[PDB]
């Protein structure tokens, strides 16, 4: 019973339910960095069930389950968060240069519906920097064979007072992009002015474009190097994601499905945080977007209409209120191939990750699956 290194050990939890009624919310989370950053947190390193594995093209993920983009803002520590359990996870989302963000406190909880409401605002230490902490994880992973196999993908936005996104979006691809296996566009923040306006299709293919013409760029003009190119986890080109706001009408979600059809992004991220909930008196008077149990059911209804407009031809990346193996599946079964936790780490703990992969594969028994992959969009018939 001093087996600490447990991630299901008792006192986690008991710390965690103190955490949730007395200490503000960004002071807990970096807390927890600081655990991280001193490789204090426990560790799962066992193995995970093969017939829960997963795939987004050449993305080979060893479970389901990763952790959602603003958790690890700066990647300070990679390592550590995804020994927890987690098969990959999303860092940033990073700006060019660094900022300090929104005035504090901007992160609220709310036990009893299991809701955060946060007004972030791309805090980050900028892309450089950022940079240079994910260059020093994979070079631990190339020494970590039990790393080897992990997935690290970069949210990438815009600096506050950037005129042209595009502009910005480029820059962190030509400094981060050749260390990520896969590079997520963040065009849904609700806590950048003017951020979400990029979701007009017009706006948002010539973004997409921007991107990915900018990644055959670095390819095109520094794979003949000395250096091989790809310092991550696939040895391979990053693919592109486009991260999307629950908060559209039915014709925006249409029109941005054809762009995505028409620009071949490798995969959508649904969804980001709401601006519609407001029946939280808790949150009554804060800004900001909410995530949580309150974003479950929009953001599945969310996965349903956009495999359904885009022909299931693009592959879904599940975000918004999963805590349990019951929630993972119904994301799965509306269309998503992954899943990502914020909320259930705020709430859940240490423990979050090793219980989920537990509650699925239970799931995966009792619904009569022989995998993972067969339950994707088992939903839609
Ligand atoms: C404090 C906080 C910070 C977040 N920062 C980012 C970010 O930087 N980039 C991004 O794309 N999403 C960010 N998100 C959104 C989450 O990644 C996720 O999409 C959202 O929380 C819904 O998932 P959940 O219900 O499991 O928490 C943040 C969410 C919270 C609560
Ligand atoms: C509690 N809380 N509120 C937040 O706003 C956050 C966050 O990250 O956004 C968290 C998560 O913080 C911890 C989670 C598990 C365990 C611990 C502890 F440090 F107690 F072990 C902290
Ligand atoms: O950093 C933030 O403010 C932030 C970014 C994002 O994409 N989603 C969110 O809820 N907060």
Redesign the pocket.
């Known amino acids: 019973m001093f087996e600490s290194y447990n991630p299901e050990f008792f006192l ?1 939890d008991i ?2 339910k ?3 009624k007395y ?1 503000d ?2 002071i ?2 970096d ?2 960095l600081l ?1 991280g950053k001193y490789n204090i947190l426990p560790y799962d390193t066992s193995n995970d069930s093969i017939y829960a594995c997963t795939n987004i093209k050449h993305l080979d993920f060893i479970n389901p389950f990763g952790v959602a983009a603003g ?1 690890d803002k700066n990647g300070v520590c990679i390592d550590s968060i995804l020994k927890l359990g987690f098969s990959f996870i999303e860092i940033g989302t990073i700006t060019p240069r660094g900022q300090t963000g929104n005035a504090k406190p901007r ?1 609220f ?1 709310d036990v009893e519906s299991r809701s ?1 409401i946060n007004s972030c605002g791309f805090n980050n230490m900028g892309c450089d920097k950022v940079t240079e902490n994910l260059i020093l994880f994979r070079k631990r992973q190339e020494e970590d064979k039990l790393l080897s196999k992990h997935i690290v993908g970069v949210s990438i936005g815009k600096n506050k007072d950037t005129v042209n996104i595009v502009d910005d979006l480029k820059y962190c691809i030509n400094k981060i992009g050749r260390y990520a296996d896969y590079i997520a566009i963040n065009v849904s923040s609700p806590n950048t002015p003017g951020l979400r306006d990029n979701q007009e299709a017009g706006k948002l293919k010539n973004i997409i474009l921007s991107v990915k013409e900018e990644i055959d760029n670095l390819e095109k003009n520094n794979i003949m190097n000395d250096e091989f190119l790809w310092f991550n986890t696939t040895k391979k080109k990053p693919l592109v994601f486009v991260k999307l706001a629950p908060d559209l009408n039915q014709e925006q979600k249409k029109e941005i499905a054809d762009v995505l059809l028409e620009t071949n992004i490798d995969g959508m991220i649904i969804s980001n945080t709401t601006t519609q909930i407001n029946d939280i008196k808790s949150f009554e008077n804060k800004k900001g977007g909410v995530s949580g149990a309150k974003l479950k059911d929009i953001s599945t209804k969310f996965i349903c209409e956009m495999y359904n407009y885009t022909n299931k031809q693009i592959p879904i990346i599940a975000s918004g209120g999963i805590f349990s193996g019951l929630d993972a599946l119904e994301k799965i079964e509306a269309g998503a191939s992954v899943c990502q936790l ?1 909320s259930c ?3 859940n ?2 423990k979050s990750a090793v219980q989920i992969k537990r509650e699925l594969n239970h799931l995966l028994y009792q619904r009569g699956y022989y995998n993972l992959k067969e339950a994707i969009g088992r939903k839609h018939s």
Do not use: A, K, P, Q
Request: include cysteine; aromatic fraction near 30%; charge should be neutral.
């Open positions: 986690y710390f965690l103190f955490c949730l200490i919310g960004e807990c989370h807390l927890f655990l958790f992160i909880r955060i914020y780490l705020v709430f703990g240490m």
